[PDB]
């Protein structure tokens, strides 16, 4: 059987071969870490982050008018009006967070320029109307739009001739030469959806059209719309469209519609249903009456089969463009694009490489190029060669998820 | 200049190279201790002998009193007019407040947090930074102890990841000359108990940029709007800092095939995954941030997370071969006292299916069984009992040799 | 269960009392135990008896308390439990019926489950993850060990797996002696014979034998216990049935 | 055969606190609800005086016979595990009881049936001549 270690054995175990410097070591590390704790506590932080200006800017205004500014003015909470009684001085207001009150005007404000349906300032006590305010411009929508030009050209997309032609037809031509359609007697579409396998090359084309657009471009975050409070997503959707309508010739771009919504289901009690409302607020605002005009919208996704069929109604989404894997000239052209900025041996032919990657998209070819560069780095070389690419191809395309590597093409000769 | 290196490393000094009870180590740690005491003494004298102080310019107290004592924090949303901006509080109640002086009217921008009064509710300052204590906590500042010396021999993988994350920093002359962008994404996959987190620890131990570590099933909140916002802030804080690196562990809790179904919570999971997927490689820019992502089963991942361009290198950790077992045994028993009888050849060759953690457990079990009978030195029979008696759960297959 | 209590004591109490012993001998302290066997054999007796003599702070996450309604919070409960265990430095956490969580990781889609898997991955990370814990022990108990997920059985998380086999003859006699203390046994009752009349007894049913003999005595308004009462209790507790069809049996030769 | 009447007869003359709960009440829509209500009913009974718990039908959640491979089978198995844990687990409670009534019990999970958890097993067979005589005289 077995036995349990007794006190005396424990005592002797901590005794033989202890060496002459055992505890004399450990106590050192002990007080080391303790004094570490002490020295880090004795250090905290400093701020200097209040935004105060140089004292000269303060001037003596601090006493003169800042002191004479707290007491004279009032907060004047801001709300909207919904139903203006006419010739009847009683107005109705809603705080959109509070209830609705019947209220009136103040003494100094004329009762004429108080058009119904606009933001107004309101006293905290008597809820009187004091001043008008311009319609809200949403803080997040201001930086929603790109206001910048990514430097990707139509010259940098290879192997997608037809899709580029169709996209151009939808977007550019009606915005520059709007006479062919009325000459023959047709009407220009206002919606294009993009679909294909992941990596095929969509968002790149979207970035390309945002370079030679000569018009407003708006990038839209798919995940920004949903919100924690109730009744927020729809509000931002309508602000987006109204602000778009304010200016002329602005483009809209969306990504992963399947994030916002592509199906409708019953129940979902509680939190879920909110997003439903949001998507509806888009749809009825996308169409209806009063043709929107030279405002175009783009939809892009990778998972088309999970979309709500209500989106594919003629008038909402008019054209659907498919992106497919490049066949042969696509591959030679893509290689020629990504390998014109690295040092290579000048006598290498790329069609051979185009053969050995049958089912591949642009991403895999770009990675093959960089990989060949890395294999050139590993040995001390300055210029990459044939064997580099030949090895990188085996490294990337085929190597992942191989089968019957040892049998190989034994039976296929 | 951005927030700069913001380096995260205690890493005082590791030189205990004697690794025994020698005098060199005692004198060296003596030097360490006395330097630390010296610095402590200096800071005590620095804080004790300050004789100069007025620090009010006869007006700083004036500004301090003009603004309220319990200042509150709100969100500016528009600035219709000078001296009459419009702000809002937490509850979404807007107020047409005024703007006072002594507030640099240069750095205010719609969406920035500001400091407000109570009684009159005007704008009196600007809050410089606002990061919730769910992202600052993710950061690391004390490096873990291990280093490359402890790894049992993975030359291919180590060289690979070094070309990925370390080399572009120290010697960034080659890549420009060749004209290539270094890879940014790495996946570590394989069976369990092989060393996937050891490389994470070892890389974090020796570096110069910021390190951020996140475990999988933590990007999830229940309020329908916090997941994606937290992801966005994570990448924002990573990019405003130094050339940091981010380590997401146990992913498969987040990304799995993006199918269509009924419940709303699963829709939320998919929404968060998709937001991260955009954040990593979406529209215009990405920045100077690397991402390491580790999992033990890979086939169940969404094809949109794995495609190249987003994750450029994939690294498989296979089971050890007989060359490596000797190295592992040599490492894990280095600081062990040990007898002349034992030969590791038999233990390494008898079995053909075990991993690093298994070897460590064999070592500790054998040492403990030696202790059981009141000894310190370890013999061969102890290792025999350790291997056979436990550390082996079993499986069956290919019965009775159908093949011959 | 002598061997089992020795090894349990060794994993649980030794590394807490004498860490310097493991500093010597140059090894690292074990931190995992798993208990398994057929139902009613003493898995929870050890947990309770350990709680009695612990000299430490005994936590008790048991059953399916950690599966919650909303998404996410079921995970953070684990994190908060472990930090609470760090507040009070030495401690033991005792799970129970753990195959309710982490049976095995299933596929995605409209099948299997996700949320429990998120929680289980959280727990998994929490004890052998990036950051190293110290002076925290775990205990787990289950039947059907063979179905458990294979990411937890690795020697990083669980070190000693202990099986509780059904008692043999000697154990049956000894359990009978423990559970017949307060009784009032007549004379000339040979408990060895009764012990051998119960092949393959589960172990929890020795209590059944004793209580049933007691109730037989009570129904007649008596305080004796004789041997016939024990025998009749033996017959009553042991009960099975077979395929009376006689055709299902015969088709196999 | 008349077992629910015997449960009623116990309810009538008792001096303790009585609860009757239908078994299928434990099935729910949302995740984790069923175990929560099992825990809650046992807490209720424990807080009060000596109590009695009656469970109407159990044929729904009474056997494993297999491992759960799909989703929503594990929910049933988890309910059963919670019941077992709650009835004889770490935290022992005293002065509580449990009554179980189902049809034929050959298919029950042997985790329930071990003594210490479900000690008494009782038959309610079909009446014979003497029983029928008594029933007729009493009813008439």
């Amino acid at each position: 059987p077995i036995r349990a270690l007794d006190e005396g054995d424990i005592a002797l175990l901590k005794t033989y071969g202890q060496s002459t410097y055992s505890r004399q070591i450990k106590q050192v590390e002990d007080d080391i870490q303790q004094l570490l704790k002490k020295i880090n506590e004795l250090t905290g932080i400093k701020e200097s982050d209040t935004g105060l200006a140089p004292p000269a800017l303060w001037d003596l205004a601090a006493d003169k008018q800042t002191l004479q500014s707290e007491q004279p003015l009032q907060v004047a909470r801001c709300t909207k009006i919904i139903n203006a009684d006419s010739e009847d001085p009683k107005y109705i207001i809603n705080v959109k967070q509070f209830a609705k009150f019947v209220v009136d005007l103040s003494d100094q404000v004329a009762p004429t320029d108080i058009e119904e349906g606009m933001r107004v300032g309101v006293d905290r006590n008597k809820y009187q109307i004091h001043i008008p305010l311009p319609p809200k411009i949403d803080p997040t929508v201001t930086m929603m739009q790109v206001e910048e030009k990514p430097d990707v050209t139509y010259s940098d997309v290879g192997g997608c001739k037809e899709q580029i032609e169709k996209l151009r037809e939808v977007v550019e031509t009606p915005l520059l030469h709007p006479e062919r359609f009325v000459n023959l007697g047709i009407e220009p579409p206002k919606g294009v959806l993009l679909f294909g396998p992941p990596g095929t090359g969509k968002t790149l084309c979207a970035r390309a059209v945002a370079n030679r657009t000569d018009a407003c471009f708006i990038r839209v975050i798919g995940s920004e719309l949903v919100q924690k409070y109730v009744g927020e997503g729809a509000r931002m959707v309508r602000e987006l469209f109204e602000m778009a309508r304010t200016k002329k010739a602005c483009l809209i771009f969306f990504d992963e519609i399947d994030a916002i919504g592509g199906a409708r289901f019953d129940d979902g009690a509680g939190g879920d249903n909110e997003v439903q409302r949001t998507m509806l607020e888009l749809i009825n605002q996308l169409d209806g009456f009063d043709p929107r005009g030279n405002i175009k919208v783009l939809m892009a996704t990778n998972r088309p089969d999970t979309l709500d069929p209500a989106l594919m109604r003629p008038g909402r989404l008019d054209r659907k463009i498919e992106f497919s894997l490049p066949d042969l000239e696509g591959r030679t052209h893509i290689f020629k694009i990504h390998a014109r900025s690295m040092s290579v041996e000048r006598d290498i032919r790329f069609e051979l490489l185009a053969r050995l990657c049958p089912n591949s998209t642009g991403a895999e070819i770009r990675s093959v190029c960089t990989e060949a560069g890395m294999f050139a780095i590993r040995a001390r070389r300055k210029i990459a060669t044939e064997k580099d690419f030949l090895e990188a191809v085996n490294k990337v395309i085929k190597s992942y998820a191989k089968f019957s590597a040892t049998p190989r093409y034994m039976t296929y000769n | 200049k951005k927030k700069t290196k913001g380096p995260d490393a205690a890493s005082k000094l590791p030189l205990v190279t004697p690794h025994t009870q020698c005098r060199l180590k005692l004198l060296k740690l003596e030097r360490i201790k006395d330097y630390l005491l010296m610095e402590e003494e200096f800071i005590r004298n620095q804080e004790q002998m300050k004789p100069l102080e007025e620090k009010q310019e006869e007006e700083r107290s004036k500004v301090d009193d003009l603004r309220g004592t319990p200042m509150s924090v709100g969100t500016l949303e528009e600035i219709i007019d000078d001296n009459h901006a419009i702000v809002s509080t937490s509850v979404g109640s807007e107020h047409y407040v005024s703007i006072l002086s002594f507030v640099d009217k240069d750095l205010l921008e719609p969406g920035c947090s500001v400091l407000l009064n109570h009684k009159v509710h005007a704008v009196i300052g600007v809050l410089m930074d606002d990061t919730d204590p769910l992202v600052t906590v993710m950061k690391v500042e004390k490096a873990p102890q291990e280093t490359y010396a402890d790894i049992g021999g993975l030359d291919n993988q180590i060289q690979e990841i070094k070309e990925s994350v370390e080399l572009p920093l120290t010697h960034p002359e080659y890549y420009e000359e060749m004209g290539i962008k270094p890879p940014k994404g790495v996946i570590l996959y394989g069976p369990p108990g092989t060393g996937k987190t050891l490389l994470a620890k070892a890389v974090a131990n020796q570096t110069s940029a910021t390190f951020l570590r996140v475990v999988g099933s933590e990007l999830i909140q229940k309020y329908l709007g916090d997941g994606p916002k937290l992801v966005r802030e994570l990448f924002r804080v990573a990019e405003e800092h130094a050339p940091s690196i981010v380590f997401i562990d146990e992913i498969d809790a987040i990304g799995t095939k993006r199918y269509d179904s009924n419940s709303g919570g699963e829709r939320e999971i998919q929404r968060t995954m998709l937001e991260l997927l955009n954040q990593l490689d979406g529209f215009d820019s990405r920045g100077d941030v690397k991402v390491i992502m580790a999992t033990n089963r890979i086939e169940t991942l969404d094809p949109a997370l794995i495609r190249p361009g987003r994750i450029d290198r994939k690294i498989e950790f296979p089971l050890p071969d007989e060359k490596t077992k000797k190295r592992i045994f040599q490492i894990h028993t280095s600081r062990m006292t040990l007898a002349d009888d034992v030969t590791l050849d038999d233990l390494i060759m008898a079995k053909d299916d075990l991993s690093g953690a298994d070897i460590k457990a064999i070592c500790t079990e054998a040492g403990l069984m030696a202790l059981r009978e009141r000894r310190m030195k370890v013999t061969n029979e102890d290792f025999k009992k350790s291997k056979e008696n436990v550390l082996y759960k079993k499986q069956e297959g290919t019965p009775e040799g159908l093949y011959l | 269960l002598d061997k089992q209590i020795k090894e349990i004591k060794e994993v649980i109490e030794l590394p807490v009392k004498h860490p310097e012993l493991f500093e010597a001998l140059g090894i690292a302290q074990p931190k995992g135990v798993l208990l398994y066997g057929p139902p009613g054999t003493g898995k929870t007796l050890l947990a309770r008896a350990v709680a009695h003599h612990t000299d430490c702070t005994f936590i008790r996450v048991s059953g399916s308390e950690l599966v919650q309604k909303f998404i996410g919070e079921g995970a953070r409960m684990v994190r908060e439990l472990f930090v609470m265990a760090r507040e009070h430095a030495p401690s033991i956490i005792f799970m129970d019926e753990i195959d309710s969580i982490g049976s095995s990781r299933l596929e995605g889609g409209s099948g299997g489950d996700s949320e429990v898997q998120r929680t289980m991955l959280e727990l998994l990370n929490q004890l052998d993850g990036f950051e190293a814990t110290k002076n925290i022990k775990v205990i787990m108990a289950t039947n059907r060990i063979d179905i458990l997920d294979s990411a937890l059985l690795r020697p990083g998380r669980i070190d000693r797996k202990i099986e509780f086999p059904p008692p043999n003859e000697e154990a049956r006699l000894d359990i009978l002696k423990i559970h017949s203390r307060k009784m009032n046994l007549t004379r000339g009752i040979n408990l060895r014979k009764i012990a051998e009349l119960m092949p393959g007894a589960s172990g929890a049913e020795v209590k059944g034998v004793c209580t049933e003999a007691g109730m037989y005595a009570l129904r007649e308004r008596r305080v004796h216990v004789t041997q016939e009462d024990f025998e009749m209790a033996v017959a009553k507790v042991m009960q099975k049935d077979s395929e009376k069809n006689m055709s299902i049996k015969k088709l196999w030769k | 055969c008349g077992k629910t009447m015997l449960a009623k007869a116990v309810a009538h003359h008792t001096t303790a606190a009585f609860i009757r709960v239908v078994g299928s009440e434990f099935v729910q829509k949302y995740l984790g609800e069923g175990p929560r209500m099992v825990r809650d009913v046992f807490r209720l009974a424990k807080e009060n005086a000596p109590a009695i718990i009656f469970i109407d039908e159990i044929d729904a959640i009474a056997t494993k016979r297999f491992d759960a491979q799909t989703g929503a089978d594990r929910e049933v198995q988890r309910i059963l595990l919670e019941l077992l844990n709650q009835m004889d687990g770490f935290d022992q409670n005293v002065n509580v009881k449990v009554i179980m009534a189902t049809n034929r019990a050959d298919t029950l999970d042997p985790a329930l049936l071990r003594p210490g958890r479900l000690d008494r097993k009782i038959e309610f067979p079909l009446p014979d001549r003497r029983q029928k005589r008594l029933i007729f005289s009493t009813i008439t």
Binding site: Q71, Q74, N125, A269, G270, E274 | G264, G265 | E115 | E75
Partner: peptide, 26 residues
């Protein structure tokens, strides 16, 4: 297709209350 599903939750907005104004205008 049986159900063992789960869901998230939206917050409770109603939290505000009125307070006594303390304007000082002569």
């Amino acid at each position: 297709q049986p159900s063992g599903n789960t869901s998230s939750s939206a917050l409770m907005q109603g939290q505000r209350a009125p307070q006594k104004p303390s304007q000082n205008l002569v």
